Design a protein around this nucleic acid. Structure first.
Ligand SMILES: [Mg+2]
Length: 1356
RNA sequence: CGAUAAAGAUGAGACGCGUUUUAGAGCUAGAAAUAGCAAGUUAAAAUAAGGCUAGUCCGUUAUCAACUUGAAAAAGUGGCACCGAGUCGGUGCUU
DNA sequence: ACGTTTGTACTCCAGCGTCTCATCTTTATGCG
DNA sequence: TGAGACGCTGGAGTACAAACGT
């Protein structure tokens, strides 16, 4: 049989609702066979439900942890390189030194050598630690002591700098220098060179004006303000070049010959400074050197707080100053505390639990916490003025290793390491040869375009090797093919050609592509002759002629008439008849002109044999941005020219990639005539054929393109096609589950395709922005709006008084004040009525002290109220209070009333969705369903895929009182899918000619301007498609209210205009929808998933005696070293075995549920029996092991259901089917103050909800019965009942708003805490999965219709 | 209509902390329990256990009923109408 | 008739900041 | 430029009464 049905879907990020409806909007019921060893053999289920799953995670955290792993590996390798340099000479000094350093973590018992790592004896270690309290004392000593040192100490200093080498954000050289002296020298050079209008901001110390903690822009403003005459571009050119790595252009700020932006801290700075010095003429030379010296001084000013005149290690000397001043402040604070407050001494200096000094040093308190703790003590104390001054400066009792050390670059550490190497090079000859080698160890850094240095066993690697040997920092440039790796870095990410998915895409500035754009805009154009109106075709002679004369002489082409006139200087004139070509051609040769200008010879650019040289040049310029790669690549082309053109074109840069390959432009020869797409675009042969036209058939190019498209595509896979879509991974998971649900539903209904599939995807500072807009409008209008009332952000949510403020305290349609004392005076009126479109947003809403401005169904009346309000709306639109579209709608009556084009726009706004992801999933479903072809090879639409927006179904909820409360249960997903199906199939049945507007596929347009052409005297049963009013859903309502105070009735049974088929019966279909929404059984299924991710919590706990700790390495006992804790269970396994119980060695047979940690998953799957015997179970039944992932469903007595959260915790698995009357009452009561409707409807709802005050007790009884049946939380239920009895004498609105909160006790899933009325009910957790082991295990399919029930009591 | 900008996704290269164990001899009185006092800023190693494919790779993303074939990819497995509805039940035909 | 493991009830806790570079879609916005 | 910080839900420890073996 045909078995007509439809499928509705509600795709979400956490759920997928589905429903099957018949032609009468009924959900069919079916009985399904259940497998397993249970007695149950058939169960009846409705064909409606939802699938719940955890949200998909993006691959960001995994990428960050992978990068961290690579960084740790490379840091360890750096330390290993330094060790293997030092090893040979270290064996002659202390042979066990590196072994003692490696084993320093483990305890004294496990050490193979002495406990003291550095010297190996107690006396020398104590003497060393007394002489150098920190590593920075040793670093400064080794820089400045000019005496032979112990090689251990030299290694310790170099290893400290190599391990923590600082950042690489500043390129080029940097050295220690004051900032004020540098500014004085900059001003000196400025005055010396200019000798006219000298900027002399004397008395204004630039020190700490530029060095202020404010941003570079604010420091620049502070410096420029103190400058007497000089302001902005000019002096701030040099100032901003000092302050930042980017600076304004030297063409205006320094009179340079070209628009070259200045730079700093980059390799491009040297080349651009050379170019700017050449352009200016060396007049600005050394005036930029003074600025660069000031830049270095300003950059180092806040990291090296010590004078450089006494040492070459300012960093270490600054750290020693910090240590010394920490010691002085600590002893002063100790003396002051004991003398003033001896009772607080123990709390401050001994208690690690608080945020005192003991908690700051030995405890977990940070610097900010310590400052916050000790600040009120220092205020309450006297004689601590310098301590407070240091505290507000954040310079009190600081540590050397702090969070703020990230500003130290690598050049400072490199300078200290170089100083030490140069100081200790005489005594150790090996250090002299390895000096450059150790320096290269510190400064080496893998380029971002090279990536991981893999041999081939890596997903993420693209590096190519010039030689097959190990990569070290010293042979990196000799082994790694940097140019090929940099090319592959970009070419692995650029998208392939859509027509042929095998080869790459051509750069967007390529010559062969720009010529394609110009000639594809050429061949379609054909000037109209004067003799005959025939446009003919712009022939190839004029193809070359136009491009050579105009495009090849101007960047942007001339005007339409100007380009003609230019050609008419060589052709017939006074005949300007363009081929409807645009005013100015969109195409532009911009890269050929750049190449001709750089090469300084047009012959090179004109040369067609030299087109490949140009192509490779543009590809090199687009690919690389490091300029060393460009230099290396273009070095091969130096012969074709000279050095000047080489360095002029090396600085050129292009961005962007096209969408065609070279094959699709000049590769495919198009069979007959042997000419490529470009050649057809040159000479169409009096046919004037565009790219789109030519890429079709009749030239055999379409056959080869289709062959490549199908061959390379290979059908891919559904998972693959979903993978390379846009959007979040969570919505990709939702789409995949949706497709699998559709396949299962098709299988369920006798392998019969549905007639229709309805698609809907959930798309779920503006208050502060609205408050700012109200303030700006009040300031612009000069009105005392705040005097009436301030813009309260508490009231910024509510839309009632929005009009009392935005409309200038004046009625919108009436020329008087709005009377803000009475908000009930105003009545919200939609500008374009709801019979036209549901524009409930405030863009259309307006209020006029309830004045009947219009007696017409038009938006406003012609002139009249519109005219009077239009002037004030001109004022409000000037203030932007009235929106542009708002004013357009308000003026539309004086603009001719409501037009047919306007109504067409309203219904296309109500119907069409603009999201591309919805189009993608609709295309996927249509491709999967419609798979048959006709005899002429034409697709036949067995099913239709309808896409709907949320506004339609939401309005269907609000108008017809099918109210949704999310907190009650998960049935609302399935109900949304059912109403999705009902609305979609009613719309396609009642309006068939609008199927091009919301159904996927190539459909006849059926222009709505002819449909919406009905007048006030409605045609009815005609081609007008009942589209005068133009609300697409208005046909659902029995009586359509109008803004003119009239009610237009609509017949009880709706039918199609052309076909005589009943599409909506208002007397039976609403009852059917109500019955379906009141059905107690819908298939809610939680997707069982094996947990993946981290092994455990990342916190490394201190050592305990517990066995819950996890060893951090193989031979690190957690009892001695601490370790990780609280692992994550991948899945639980039900084992049946005999265990060693009792001191009498008894094999007590036991059935247990053991969880498999993610760490142990591979070991368990390699050999489950060996793993279980290792765990402690003897004689395991191998075939009785049941893998139970998370959310595994178990059924118990009285229908109680539990989901497996873990091996030792359960979740609630039941669903509360609250009756429709109670959820409707709860929605109406909770939304008392936010009814958002007509005043009569609001009064009726208030009367209905006041008449059913007893419904609260019934809802409480329902919750109590459901909790006593399946929840089994006695104490929480008693607290809930006591709280409800306590707050009985409360208004209905808050009572129902908190009864809504009460539903989380009975909600499906993990238990959660909730608050009813100032009382918090903590969650009751089922932390014992012992009753599960004798329950019924339910294996569910994706829809849950197919089941397999296993009685676990019978296993064992 | 170009064009910019934001958001999101993906990949690479790097810093600074944080945590853990050890090293930085605690002194005095008391037999000890305990007290009074002195100190404290730093370093080494690890930073998912680990894997082989031994790279200066890889290891937290995606995929996720049960059962029957297949190494895997994957394929295959479950009757329909009507009356009703507290998580689905009952009746009739054929299997 | 105690010890001994198990079942409620409650509390606490969970690695985090920054920078450079590149490639895509998809929306939007001011621009024409 | 502008901070807004938070939940979530499973593990672990602690205290104490009760089902439970000898
Ligand atoms: Mg939903």
């Amino acid at each position: 049989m045909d078995k007509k049905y439809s499928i509705g879907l509600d795709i979400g990020t956490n759920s997928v609702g589905w429903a099957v409806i018949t032609d009468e909007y009924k959900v069919p019921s079916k009985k399904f066979k259940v497998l397993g060893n249970t007695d149950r053999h058939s169960i009846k289920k409705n064909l409606i439900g939802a699938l719940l799953f955890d949200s998909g995670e993006t691959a960001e955290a995994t990428r960050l942890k992978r990068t961290a792993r690579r960084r740790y590996t490379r840091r360890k390798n750096r330390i290993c390189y330094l060790q293997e340099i030092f090893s040979n000479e270290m064996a002659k000094v202390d042979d066990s030194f590196f072994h003692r350093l490696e084993e320093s973590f483990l305890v004294e018992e496990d050490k193979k050598h002495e406990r003291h790592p550095i010297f190996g004896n107690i006396v020398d270690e104590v003497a060393y630690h007394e002489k150098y309290p920190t590593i920075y004392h040793l670093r400064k000593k080794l820089v400045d002591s000019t005496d032979k040192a112990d090689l251990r100490l030299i290694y310790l200093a170099l290893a400290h700098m190599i391990k923590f080498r600082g950042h690489f954000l500043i390129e080029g050289d940097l050295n220690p220098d004051d900032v004020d002296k540098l500014f004085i020298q900059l001003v000196q050079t400025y005055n010396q060179l200019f000798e006219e209008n000298p900027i002399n901001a004397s008395g204004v110390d630039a020190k700490a004006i530029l060095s202020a903690r404010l941003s570079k822009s604010r420091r620049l403003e502070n410096l420029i303000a103190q400058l007497p005459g000089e302001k902005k571009n000019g002096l701030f050119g040099n100032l901003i070049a000092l302050s930042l790595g980017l600076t304004p252009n030297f063409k205006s700020n320094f009179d340079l010959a070209e628009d070259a932006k200045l730079q700093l801290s980059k390799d491009t700075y040297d080349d651009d400074l050379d170019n700017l010095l050449a352009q200016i003429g060396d007049q600005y030379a050394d005036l930029f050197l003074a600025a660069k010296n000031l830049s270095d001084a300003i950059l180092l000013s806040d990291i090296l707080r010590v004078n450089t005149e006494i040492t070459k290690a300012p960093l270490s000397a600054s750290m020693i100053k910090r240590y010394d001043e920490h010691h002085q402040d600590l002893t002063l604070l100790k003396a002051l505390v004991r003398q003033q407050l001896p009772e607080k001494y123990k709390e401050i200096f001994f208690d690690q639990s608080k945020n005192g000094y003991a908690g700051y040093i030995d405890g977990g308190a940070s610097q900010e916490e310590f400052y916050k703790f000790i600040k009120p003590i220092l205020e309450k104390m006297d004689g601590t003025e310098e301590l407070l001054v240091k505290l507000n400066r954040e310079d009190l009792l600081r540590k050397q290793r702090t969070f703020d050390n990230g500003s130290i670059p690598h050049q400072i550490h490199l300078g200290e390491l170089h100083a030490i190497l140069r100081r200790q090079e005489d005594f150790y000859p090996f250090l002299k040869d390895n000096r450059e080698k150790i320096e290269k160890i510190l400064t080496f850094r893998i380029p971002y375009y090279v990536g991981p240095l893999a041999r081939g066993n890596s997903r993420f690697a693209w590096m190519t090797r010039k030689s097959e040997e190990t990569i070290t920092p010293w042979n990196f440039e000799e082994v790694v093919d940097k140019g090929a790796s940099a090319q592959s870095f970009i070419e692995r990410m650029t998208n392939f050609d859509k027509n042929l998915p095998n080869e790459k895409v051509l750069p967007k500035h390529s010559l062969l592509y720009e010529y394609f754009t110009v000639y594809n805009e050429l061949t379609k154009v054909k000037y109209v002759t004067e003799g005959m109106r025939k446009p003919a075709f712009l022939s190839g002679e004029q193809k070359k002629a136009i491009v050579d004369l105009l495009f090849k002489t101007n960047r942007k082409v001339t005007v339409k008439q100007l380009k003609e006139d230019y050609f008419k200087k060589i052709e017939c004139f006074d005949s300007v008849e363009i081929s409807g070509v645009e005013d100015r051609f969109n195409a532009s040769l911009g890269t050929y002109h750049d190449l001709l200008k750089i090469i300084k010879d047009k012959d090179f650019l004109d040369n067609e044999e030299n087109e490949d040289i140009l192509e490779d040049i543009v590809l090199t310029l687009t690919l690389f941005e490091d300029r060393e790669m460009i230099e290396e690549r273009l070095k091969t082309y130096a012969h074709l020219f000279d050095d000047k053109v080489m360095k002029q074109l090396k600085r050129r840069r292009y961005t962007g990639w096209g969408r065609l390959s070279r094959k699709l432009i000049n590769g495919i020869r198009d069979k007959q005539s042997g000419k490529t797409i470009l050649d057809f675009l040159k000479s169409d042969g009096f046919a004037n054929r565009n790219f789109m036209q030519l890429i079709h058939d009749d030239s055999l190019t379409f056959k080869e393109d289709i062959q490549k498209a199908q061959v390379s595509g290979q059908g891919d896979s559904l998972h693959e096609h979903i993978a390379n879509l846009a959007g979040s991974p969570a919505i990709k998971k939702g789409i995949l589950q949706t497709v699998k649900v559709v396949d299962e539903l098709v299988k369920v209904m006798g392998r019969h395709k549905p007639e229709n599939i309805v698609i809907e995807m959930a798309r779920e500072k503006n208050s502060r922005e609205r408050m700012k807009r109200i303030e700006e409008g009040i300031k612009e209008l000069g009105s005392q709006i705040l005097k009436e009332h301030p813009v309260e952000n508490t009231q910024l949510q509510n839309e009632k008084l929005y009009l009392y403020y935005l409309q200038n305290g004046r009625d919108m349609y009436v020329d008087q004040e709005l009377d803000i004392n009475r908000l009930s005076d105003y009545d919200v009126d939609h500008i374009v009525p709801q019979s036209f479109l549901k524009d409930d947003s405030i863009d259309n809403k307006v209020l006029t002290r309830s004045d009947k401005n219009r007696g017409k169904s038009d938006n406003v009346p012609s002139e009249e109220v519109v005219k009077k309000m239009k002037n004030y709306w001109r004022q409000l639109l000037n203030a932007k209070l009235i929106t542009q579209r708002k004013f357009d709608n308000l003026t539309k009556a004086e603009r001719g009333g409501l037009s047919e084009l306007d109504k067409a726009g309203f219904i296309k706004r109500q119907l069409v969705e603009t999201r591309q992801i919805t189009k993608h999933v609709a295309q996927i479903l249509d491709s999967r369903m419609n798979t048959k072809y006709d005899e002429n090879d034409k697709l036949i639409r067995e099913v239709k895929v309808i896409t709907l927006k949320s506004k339609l179904v939401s309005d269907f909820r609000k108008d017809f009182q099918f109210y949704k409360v999310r907190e009650i249960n998960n049935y609302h997903h399935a109900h949304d899918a059912y109403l999705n199906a009902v609305v979609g199939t009613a719309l396609i049945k009642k309006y068939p000619k609008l199927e091009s507007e919301f159904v996927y596929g190539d459909y006849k347009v059926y222009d709505v301007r002819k449909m919406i052409a009905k007048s006030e005297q409605e045609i009815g049963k005609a081609t007008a498609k009942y589209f005068f009013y133009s609300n697409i859903m208005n046909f659902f309502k029995t009586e359509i209210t109008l803004a003119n105070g009239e009610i237009r009735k609509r017949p009880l049974i709706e039918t199609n205009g052309e076909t005589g088929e009943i599409v909506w019966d208002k007397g039976r279909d609403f009852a059917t929808v109500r019955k379906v929404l009141s059905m107690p059984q819908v298939n809610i299924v939680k997707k069982t998933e094996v947990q993946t991710g981290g092994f455990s919590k990342e916190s490394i706990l201190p050592k305990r005696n517990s066995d819950k700790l996890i060893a951090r390495k193989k031979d690190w006992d957690p009892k001695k070293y601490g370790g990780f804790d609280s692992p994550t269970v991948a899945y639980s396994v039900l084992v049946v075995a005999k265990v060693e119980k009792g001191k009498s060695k008894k094999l007590k047979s036991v059935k247990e549920l053991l969880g498999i940690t993610i760490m142990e998953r591979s070991s368990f799957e390699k050999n489950p029996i060996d793993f279980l015997e290792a765990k402690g179970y003897k004689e395991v039944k191998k075939d009785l092991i049941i893998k139970l992932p998370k959310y595994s469903l178990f059924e118990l007595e009285n229908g109680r259901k539990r989901m497996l959260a873990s091996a030792g915790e359960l979740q609630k698995g039941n669903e509360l089917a609250l009756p429709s009357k109670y959820v409707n009452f709860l929605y109406l009561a909770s939304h008392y103050e936010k009814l958002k409707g007509s005043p009569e409807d609001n009064e009726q709802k208030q009367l209905f909800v006041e008449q059913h005050k007893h419904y609260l007790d019934e809802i409480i009884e329902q919750i109590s019965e459901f909790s006593k049946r399946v929840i089994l939380a006695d104490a929480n239920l008693d607290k809930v009942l006591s709280a409800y009895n306590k707050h009985r004498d409360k208004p209905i609105r808050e009572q129902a708003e908190n009864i809504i909160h009460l539903f989380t006790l009975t909600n499906l899933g993990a238990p959660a805490a909730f608050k009813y009325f100032d009382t918090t009910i903590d969650r009751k957790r089922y932390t014992s999965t012992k009753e599960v082991l004798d329950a019924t295990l339910i294996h569910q399919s994706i829809t849950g219709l197919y089941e397999t029930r296993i009685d676990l009591s019978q296993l064992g």
